[PDB]
């Protein structure tokens, strides 16, 4: 049969709380660090590669670091298999909106889209949920500069500055102590930086294993320059900070 | 199809639409409206094709107003423009024709100018400074092209538009029984009762 | 009636996903392979064994072709490599080249791929396919390049990794034997080195299968006379070729 | 799928529903209360979490339509789901009947949705109350309804849902009468003030606060206001129940 | 514990469900069938299990097409199902080539669609053994249908309880006759060799039924054995066991 | 988890109980196979045993025919073996259909191993619990063997035996070509090949044989045939006088 | 959940119990008695009621005007396969403009019967169904089993107190066959019958309900005071 | 609590009592209900509920237990009321269906034994037809109406798919110390003031609250005026008139 070989995996505890979401929570703090930081002038999404040898090829590796659409990129933290699916579905539903009212989409209506996805796995079907947490970095006209997070149950909060993944805690407090409520990209550079330092199972952290991108308001007056780091760039700021 | 015309003033859009409605072959109505405000600041007036006018027209009001209600924010005149001709697109391919040409008029707070569009039955938007359709267009065009300026008062586009008004009821051999006119603007949508 | 609709898969309550790593688990009782990327082309190696030594394994392959730039080969599961390696060919034909007409960059068929074991790990009446890919390729924006893909659908690009249950041994020797500049020469008589750690039965040409996505050959075209049609950058080297390079260490 | 996830319970149940009541206890505690010329939602905003921006973060009182503002409490993903669905139907309503919705037929429908997927198999129960509040068009009956995840509907004069939400109730029997609600927008918003500021703490960073006056009128009220009459009620308060506490010493 | 599904092995090479299937057969009654020569002669042993019960006007032989006797023990129901699904099957044949179903055609769609049904889950196993032979133009043939959907051919085949002592008569009958009988003839020994296989069975009482296809006497179409000669097969039989 | 033998699902081990098992119920009959390769021929014998007289013997197969050029020899239960026959005649004739020639061995093998692939992938499938023999003569590669089995894997040989007693077999191929240092016996005459064949099981086996012990199918160029009885018992005679 | 599961199981004695459970709902339902002649059928059927307040429960349902059934079981299983009976004899007037005969519906409804035991997700029925009427080949009295056997008798019984009915009906059984052209001997003969199926409840005149069919009667169903002339 | 049973992964499976065991539970769940009392008369049908309150915050006027199904039908419902929101929609659905029709009233057994039809339909997939709910409804009506053949009716619908028509039946918590009364106290003399005030009297003694109008709910259904519920003010005055006849015993 069939019904004899189900556990039911979509209903209640007497928590009121499924298994599924928590388990898969469990699961990302187990995965490299993800760090955004909103300064008045950019966000740095700056994100931590939980492999590495001295035979991996970090320069066609973009396995955290992601473009949705050319205003919005997203750091991802979780099974970076299910990840591929939601990302190539994000990039769809961007196009979709953009398309029909020919207009860039909010980052709202995006980080909202996905929710739902997520939302549709645990609401129905005994369907496992997507183990993914994002961290959202877009602009758009109506709030400016935008940074939102998502769990698997499928919610949203917007924040100001957050950490997901592995030392989620810990990472959060560094960023309490030292958070100036208005900075540069470069005294936000410097804080991303030396939290990923603080947080590394390494003895150092190296431009080896550090993915890194910005959106900067480095071009002005509607025009933003999204940038994906070279390796050897992310080398040349981490002399800067003096960790190297 | 009768009277529907637009010319965009310096700060506004100042549509009018036809009082007359002839099914058959007696006028039945003569002070209704073809028109509806789709949002605070952008207004959609219509003419083609009997009763495809009248349930498409309130198909739009309703799916831009889905749209208002979840981002607590309008639409730019730009992007409801875009709406209307993806769906009149999908239309023209689709099993039973809709037949609907329309003056999207709005201003919008945001870019801090009216905007004017023009979209016909086939779907081809076009930004404009002045429009038609139809057999009003065809009178009115090289009409409006002569006396126009490029900043033009708002009471001077009424007294362009009532110009325009004036020749068309010579030269048509339908008659329409007088326009409604309706100013879009940045102070809200509001009529003006004067003919 | 029928109602699996509902996943196989499952996370553990210590996180993860429970069958991903049971199937890794089945990568560690298959064959070994390695690949190695050279500055000028790729070189691919494993080994050719057989249930019964009167099989033919001649008229056997374990290196097989998805396009002319872009080869596969496996450790793992037989059965499981065959099929995904047909619908690899179909998703390749279907989504790059109605679409645009010639075949697809590496990295483009490596998503590719990826989706499928993806569907395999999610929806109902499904495991994950038990394999480790490597799938070499060459394209022609950024060059030479090796990816593996995992049981889990996640890939990784590296410039020389090994698979199976010799793996250990052979990374620890590519740790060493892997350079900034390589000869594809130099790459060929390093790979089979490696593998020999990893044979323990014979050892001959006729049993070390090497594919090369070295550079073009235009006698494998069939026809001549159009500089603009490249040749295949793929060549599976027959075994006669294969026996000199033992002795060529 | 199609296979039942809900299985009816010899003891005049389903395990499910009542799992589901559950998730709105450990859900967060909004407070709901109709005067005579308003109706009032105070919700909590749960803001434990230090560096949040809350101009992006939504908030946790969602307006349907352009005179109907519903809150909710329990589980945040799926309420989301459900305010969709109603917003869908807030604007079929004009396409096909004209006029905007009434509180009632909306009500009615967001209690058979929640139904659906009881009744039908491979869709399990949701685990979100409603308040549903708003003036019908052109009366001024402020109706203040409430529906669960049961698939249940009810009308309220005043009510709460989410933690500690009992502790609340047991306050609005004595504070808030049947006969007499409060009559001005002022009044009836510094009832519901108290209300949160026994059950959330924490100062007015918590409290959010929509008020809706009759035929479209729909403000939420600014920090500044709120800060006022939380420190007006604290210092009131303070006043009255150390000149209690006198008048005690001496008796 | 391999009984939870139809699609389960043991390592003893059992599948449990189906083999428990055959445990359903058993308690069937005594059916035969006799490849004769000119055709073949099935016979079912319809129990009278009351008086209250109206005889001879209930059958166990049903025919498919015309020219395919089918006769079944097991589940009666189970067996009505089966049989009405070859009627379905048979006729398609007949539309598309118009020529009635050869008897090892008919053979075939029977057997794969009883095997179908360990292939899935969904469904539930067959327990019944089904007897079907006929005359086609290629000649007379006889099949045995197991519920596992296994078949081979058969020069005398049985199914019942009384199963131990038919097999075994009919080893007797086909070491008599070497070179085989008469379907005429075979009216006669069908009747006999129930009655010996309801000694074990001697409980109840029973009512004979016969039926044939035979290229001599019924022209190839299958029809009932009646009148005279029915009643005379049964006292053949009667003077045989005293 | 809990559930890895009797759903298609690893272990902790990283194996699957479910598709052993299927390897472990292909002993049940208790059929040998030989097959070896002439220079021009292929040579496929297999059992024929019956446990009573009262089975008809000519319906008694395991050489069934696909195609017009490939022949199929199954090892493992009846059942099964129809379900393996008929598919593959479904493929056989859509491949025709749609390149305009007739299927080869080597796709008809990759073709049965990748619907095998789906039955041990899908939850509510129920594996082939055959190996398949797929005997050739084709006119691009030659005399071919290609095995197919319950995992859904192929492999190519230069001769191959199944069965329960096999390792004997595989001794007497091992001496063959050990001796010959060459791939393949180098015979003129398709019959003498059936005797070389013979010859090797009966010593194998350590067992006499009878013509209908035996069953013989012989692919050639452009047609595949099975020998009747009577043609079978002369390749005995013309053993015994060799 | 043994042997002893869902439509699915064997079970080492050969059984389906799903069966054997079903059958149960029959005895835990209220008796009815069939017995026919060559020129006439009559079913004599108790009701039931729930209490004093309560009416009793309909036991006959006509299917046509001259093929009737009476149940014996659960209610809502009766109504899926008595909605059924009716619709195949319509179609069979509409069709073959021909009445629907007694014999072969017993042999549709089998099979209706077979495949939700064939499948998994299904139950049996928990309704037998007794079937009379008059066609063209004469009386017909078929007895309906959550087996989905169908079975021709002379007089048959389901219920509690089934064996009560059948030994009046074994002794008297060769009296009433030559019985015909006379409906109301047949009446009195089955009331008779179900007196020896008493939980003393009594015979009484809206406890007991009646049906007949005739060569030369339709389909009448007598019910209220119609019953009275037989007791 | 937790049953000893062997099913709770099936929903139509049976038994060895050889009932449908959910039906069973269904029945389990009618004693949760609010006490609805109901007497029929023959000179029209008095349906009285318990509305139910739970706080004296809670209105409770606008909360009713009555539903109109049409002009000649009502129908109180007690159990759980999500459940009987879907029933009763279907049952005006057919109503106005059958006008359509033939412009003609519609039987008040033709209608219950309907909604007794949609109650069968629990399933995963069982018979031709499909399953549109996985489990039985847990709530029990009392159909009154009218009807020209057999004139004022009063039926009882179980989720079970069966109906019995009553003289008199309760439903409800307080359901068996009503009906032993109703068994008592009936006689088919009774007028529509006399059932009337029976309704209050014998709803006072399985009250749990208090017997007032806020609180209690009176309906009638009348030949030539119709359904009509009465009005809360109505309802005080019959309060009252038993409160006289109670102190003249």
Same mark, same amino acid.
């Given at each position: ?76 933290? /979780? ?64 709030? /400016? ?96 900070? /003096?960790?190297? | ?195 | ?249 | ?110 209690? @058979? ?13 949701? @685990? ?22 049961? @698939? ?9 849902? @989410? ?89 | ?242 | ?242 | ?231 | ?249």
């Amino acid at each position: 049969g069939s019904r004899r070989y189900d556990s039911r995996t979509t209903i209640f505890s007497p928590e009121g709380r499924l298994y599924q979401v928590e388990y898969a929570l469990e699961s990302i703090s187990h995965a490299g660090t993800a760090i955004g930081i909103m300064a008045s002038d950019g966000i740095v999404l700056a994100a931590e590669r939980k492999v590495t040898s001295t035979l991996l090829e970090q320069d066609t590796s973009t396995e955290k670091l992601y473009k949705l659409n050319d205003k919005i990129a997203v750091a991802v933290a /979780g099974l970076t298999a299910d990840a591929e699916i939601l990302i190539n579905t994000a990039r769809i539903h961007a196009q979709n909106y953009l398309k029909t009212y020919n207009e860039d989409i909010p980052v709202e209506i995006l980080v909202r889209r996905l929710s739902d996805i997520k939302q549709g796995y645990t609401q129905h079907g005994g369907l496992r949920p997507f183990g993914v947490s994002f961290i959202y970095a877009g602009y758009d006209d109506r709030y /400016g500069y935008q940074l939102y997070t998502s769990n698997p149950s499928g919610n949203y909060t917007g924040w100001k500055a957050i950490s997901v993944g592995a030392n989620t805690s810990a990472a959060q407090t560094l960023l309490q102590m030292d958070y100036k409520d208005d900075m540069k990209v470069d005294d936000a550079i410097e804080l991303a930086l030396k939290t990923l330092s603080k947080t590394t199972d390494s003895s150092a952290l190296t431009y080896d294993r550090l993915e890194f991108a910005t959106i900067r308001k480095g071009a002005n007056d509607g025009e933003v320059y999204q940038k994906i780091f070279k390796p050897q760039e992310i080398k040349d700021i981490l002399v800067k900070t /003096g960790i190297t | 199809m009768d009277i529907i015309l637009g010319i965009r003033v310096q700060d506004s859009v100042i549509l009018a639409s036809s009082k007359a409605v002839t099914r058959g072959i007696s006028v039945l109505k003569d002070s209704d409206d073809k028109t509806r405000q789709l949002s605070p600041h952008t207004l959609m007036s219509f003419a083609g094709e009997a009763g495809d006018t009248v349930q498409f027209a309130e198909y739009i009001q309703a799916n831009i107003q889905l749209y208002s209600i979840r981002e607590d924010y309008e639409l730019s005149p730009q992007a409801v423009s875009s709406f209307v001709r993806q769906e009149l697109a999908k239309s023209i391919r689709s099993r039973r024709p809709y037949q609907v040409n329309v003056l999207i008029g709005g201003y919008d707070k945001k870019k801090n100018k009216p905007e004017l569009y023009q979209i016909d039955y086939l779907g081809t938007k076009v930004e404009l400074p002045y429009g038609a359709h139809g057999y009003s267009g065809f009178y009115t065009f090289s009409l409006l092209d002569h006396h126009y300026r490029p900043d033009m008062t708002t009471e001077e586009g009424l007294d362009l538009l009532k110009l325009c008004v004036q020749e068309l009821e010579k030269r048509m051999p339908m008659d329409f029984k007088g326009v409604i006119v309706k100013i879009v603007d940045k102070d809200g949508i509001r009529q003006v009762d004067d003919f | 009636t029928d109602r699996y609709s509902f996943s196989l898969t499952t996370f553990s309550p210590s996180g993860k996903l429970g069958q991903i790593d049971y199937a890794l688990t089945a990568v560690k009782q298959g064959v070994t392979s390695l690949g190695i990327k050279a500055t000028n082309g790729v070189v691919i190696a494993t080994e050719k064994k057989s249930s019964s030594p009167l099989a033919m394994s001649e008229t056997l392959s374990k290196v097989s072709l998805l396009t002319p730039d872009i080869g596969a080969v496996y450790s793992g599961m037989g059965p499981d490599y065959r099929v995904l390696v047909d619908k690899s060919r179909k998703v390749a034909h279907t989504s790059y080249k109605r679409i645009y007409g010639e075949y697809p960059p590496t990295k483009l068929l490596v998503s590719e791929v990826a989706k499928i074991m993806q569907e395999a790990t999610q929806s109902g009446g499904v495991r994950p396919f038990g394999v480790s890919l490597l799938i070499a390729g060459h394209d022609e924006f950024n060059g030479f390049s090796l990816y593996q893909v995992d049981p889990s659908g996640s890939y990784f690009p590296w410039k020389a990794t090994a698979i199976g249950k010799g793996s250990v041994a052979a990374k620890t020797f590519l740790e060493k034997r892997w350079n900034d500049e390589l000869e594809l020469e130099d790459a060929i008589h390093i790979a089979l080195l490696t593998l020999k750690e990893s044979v323990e039965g014979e050892f001959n040409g006729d049993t070390i299968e090497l594919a090369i996505i070295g550079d073009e050959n235009p006698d494998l075209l069939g026809y001549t006379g159009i500089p603009t049609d490249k040749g295949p950058r793929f060549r599976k080297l027959t075994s006669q070729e294969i026996n000199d390079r033992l002795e060529a260490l | 799928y199609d296979r039942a996830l809900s299985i009816f319970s010899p003891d005049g149940h389903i395990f499910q529903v009542e799992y589901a009541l559950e998730a709105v206890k450990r859900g967060t505690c909004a407070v709901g209360v109709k005067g005579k010329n308003c109706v009032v939602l105070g919700c909590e905003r749960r803001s434990t979490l230090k560096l949040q921006d809350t101009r992006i973060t939504p908030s946790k009182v969602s307006k349907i339509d352009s005179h109907v503002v519903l809150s909710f409490s329990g589980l945040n993903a799926d309420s989301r789901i459900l305010i969709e669905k109603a917003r869908v139907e807030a604007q079929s309503h004009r396409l096909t009947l004209e006029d905007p919705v009434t509180v009632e037929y909306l009500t009615r429908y967001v209690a @058979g949705v929640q139904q659906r997927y009881t009744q039908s198999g491979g869709v399990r129960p949701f @685990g979100v109350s409603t308040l549903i509040a708003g003036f019908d068009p052109r009366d001024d009956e402020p109706k203040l309804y409430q529906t669960e995840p049961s @698939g249940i509907y009810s009308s309220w004069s005043a009510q709460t849902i @989410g933690r500690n939400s009992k502790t609340v109730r047991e306050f609005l029997e004595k504070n808030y009468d049947r006969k007499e609600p409060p009559a001005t927008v002022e009044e009836c918003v510094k009832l519901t003030v108290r209300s949160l500021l026994e059950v959330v703490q924490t100062g007015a960073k918590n409290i959010e606060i929509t008020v809706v006056k009759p035929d479209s009128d729909i403000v939420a009220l600014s920090s500044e206001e709120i800060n006022q009459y939380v420190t007006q009620i604290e210092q009131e308060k303070q006043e009255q129940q150390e000149q209690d506490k006198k008048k005690k010493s001496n008796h | 514990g391999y009984d939870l599904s139809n699609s389960v092995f043991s390592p003893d090479g059992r599948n449990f469900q189906v083999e428990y299937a055959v445990k359903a057969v058993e308690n069937g009654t005594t059916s035969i069938g006799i490849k004769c020569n000119d055709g073949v002669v099935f016979a079912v042993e319809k129990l009278i299990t009351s008086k209250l019960l109206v005889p001879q006007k209930n059958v166990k032989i049903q025919v498919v097409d015309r020219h395919i006797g089918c006769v079944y023990s097991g589940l009666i129901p189970d067996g009505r199902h089966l049989v009405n699904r070859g009627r379905e099957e048979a006729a398609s044949f007949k539309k598309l080539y118009k020529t009635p179903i050869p008897i090892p055609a008919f053979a075939d769609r029977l057997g794969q669609y009883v095997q179908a049904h360990t292939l899935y889950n969904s469904v539930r196993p067959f327990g019944v053994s089904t007897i079907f032979g006929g005359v086609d133009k290629n000649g007379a043939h006889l099949y045995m249908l197991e519920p596992s959907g296994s078949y081979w051919g058969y020069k005398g085949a049985a199914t019942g309880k009384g199963r131990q002592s038919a097999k075994a008569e009919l080893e007797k009958l086909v070491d008599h006759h070497p070179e085989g009988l008469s379907a005429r003839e075979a009216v006669k020994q069908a009747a006999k060799i129930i009655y010996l296989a309801h000694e074990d069975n001697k409980e109840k009482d029973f009512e004979l039924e016969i039926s044939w296809c035979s290229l001599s006497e019924t022209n190839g179409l299958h029809k009932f054995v009646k009148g005279d000669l029915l009643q005379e097969a049964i006292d053949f039989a009667q003077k045989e066991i005293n | 988890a809990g559930y890895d033998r009797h759903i298609t699902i690893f272990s902790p081990e990283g194996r699957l109980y479910q598709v052993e098992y299927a390897f472990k119920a292909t002993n049940q009959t208790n059929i040998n196979s030989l097959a070896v390769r002439g220079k021009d021929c292929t040579v496929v014998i297999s059992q024929k045993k019956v446990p009573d007289k009262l089975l008809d013997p000519t319906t008694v197969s395991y050489i069934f025919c696909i195609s017009r050029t490939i022949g199929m020899v199954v090892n493992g239960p009846i059942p099964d073996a129809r379900n393996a026959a008929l598919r593959a005649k479904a493929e056989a004739a859509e491949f025709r259909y749609k390149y305009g020639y007739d299927m080869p061995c080597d796709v008809l093998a990759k073709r049965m191993a990748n619907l095998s692939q789906i039955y041990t992938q899908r939850a509510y499938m129920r594996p082939l619990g055959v190996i398949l023999t797929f005997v050739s003569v084709d006119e691009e590669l030659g005399p071919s063997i290609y095995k197919t089995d319950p995992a859904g894997y192929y492999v190519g040989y230069k001769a191959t035996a199944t069965g329960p007693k096999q390792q004997e077999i595989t001794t007497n191929l091992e001496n063959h070509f050990k001796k010959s240092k060459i791939d393949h016996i180098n015979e003129e005459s398709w019959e003498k090949v059936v005797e070389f064949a013979i010859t090797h099981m009966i010593d194998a086996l350590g067992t006499e044989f009878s013509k209908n012990d035996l069953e013989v199918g012989v692919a050639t160029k452009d047609k595949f045939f099975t020998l009747s009885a009577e043609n079978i018992e002369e390749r005995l005679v013309a053993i015994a006088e060799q | 959940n043994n042997y002893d599961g869902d439509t699915v199981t064997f079970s080492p004695t050969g059984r389906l119990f799903q069966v054997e459970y079903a059958l149960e709902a029959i005895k835990q339902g209220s008796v009815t008695v069939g017995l026919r002649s060559n020129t006439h059928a009559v079913l004599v059927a108790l009701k039931r009621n729930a209490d004093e307040l309560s009416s009793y429960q309909k036991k006959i349902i006509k299917c046509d005007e001259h093929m009737g059934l009476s149940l014996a079981g659960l209610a809502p299983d009766a109504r899926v396969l008595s909605n059924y009976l009716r619709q195949q004899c319509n179609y069979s007037s509409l069709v073959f403009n021909r009445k629907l005969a007694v014999e072969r519906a017993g042999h549709l409804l089998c099979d209706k019967a077979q495949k939700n035991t064939q499948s998994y997700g299904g139950r049996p029925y928990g309704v037998g169904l007794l079937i009379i009427g008059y066609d063209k080949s004469g009386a017909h009295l078929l007895e309906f089993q959550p087996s989905g056997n169908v079975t021709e008798l002379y007089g048959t019984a389901i219920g509690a107190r089934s064996q009560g009915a059948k030994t009046y009906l074994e002794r008297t059984l060769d009296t009433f066959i030559k019985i015909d052209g006379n409906p109301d001997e047949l009446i009195k003969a089955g009331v008779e019958a179900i007196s020896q199926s008493l939980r003393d409840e009594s015979l009484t005149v809206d406890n007991l309900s009646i049906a007949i069919v005739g060569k030369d009667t339709p389909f009448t169903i007598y019910d209220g005071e119609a019953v009275a002339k037989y007791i | 609590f937790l049953t000893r049973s062997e099913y709770d992964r099936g929903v139509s499976t049976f038994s060895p009592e050889g009932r449908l065991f959910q039906v069973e539970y269904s029945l389990e769940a009618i004693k949760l209900g609010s006490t609805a009392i109901g007497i029929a008369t023959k000179e029209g049908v008095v349906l009285g509920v318990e509305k139910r309150a739970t706080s004296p915050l809670l209105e409770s006027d606008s909360i009713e237990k009555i539903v109109e199904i049409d002009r000649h039908i009502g129908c109180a419902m007690s159990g759980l009321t999500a459940d009987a929101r879907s029933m009763i929609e279907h049952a005006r659905t057919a109503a106005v269906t059958h006008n359509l029709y033939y412009d003609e009233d519609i039987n008040v057994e033709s209608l219950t034994q309907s909604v007794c039809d949609l109650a069968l339909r629990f399933g995963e997939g069982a018979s031709g037809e499909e399953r549109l709910m996985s489990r039985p409804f847990g709530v029990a009506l009392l159909i009154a109406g009218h009807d020209a053949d057999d004139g004022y009716q009063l039926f009882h619908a179980e989720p079970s798919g069966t109906f019995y028509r009553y003289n008199a039946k309760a439903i409800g918590s307080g359901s068996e110390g009503a009906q032993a009364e109703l068994l008592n106290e009936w006689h088919s003399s009774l007028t529509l003031k006399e059932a009337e005030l029976l309704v209050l009297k014998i709803l006072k003694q399985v009250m749990e609250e208090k017997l007032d109008e806020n609180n209690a709910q009176l309906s009638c259904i009348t030949k030539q005026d119709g359904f009509k519920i009465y009005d809360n003010e109505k309802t005080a005055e019959l309060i009252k008139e038993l409160k006289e006849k109670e102190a003249a015993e």
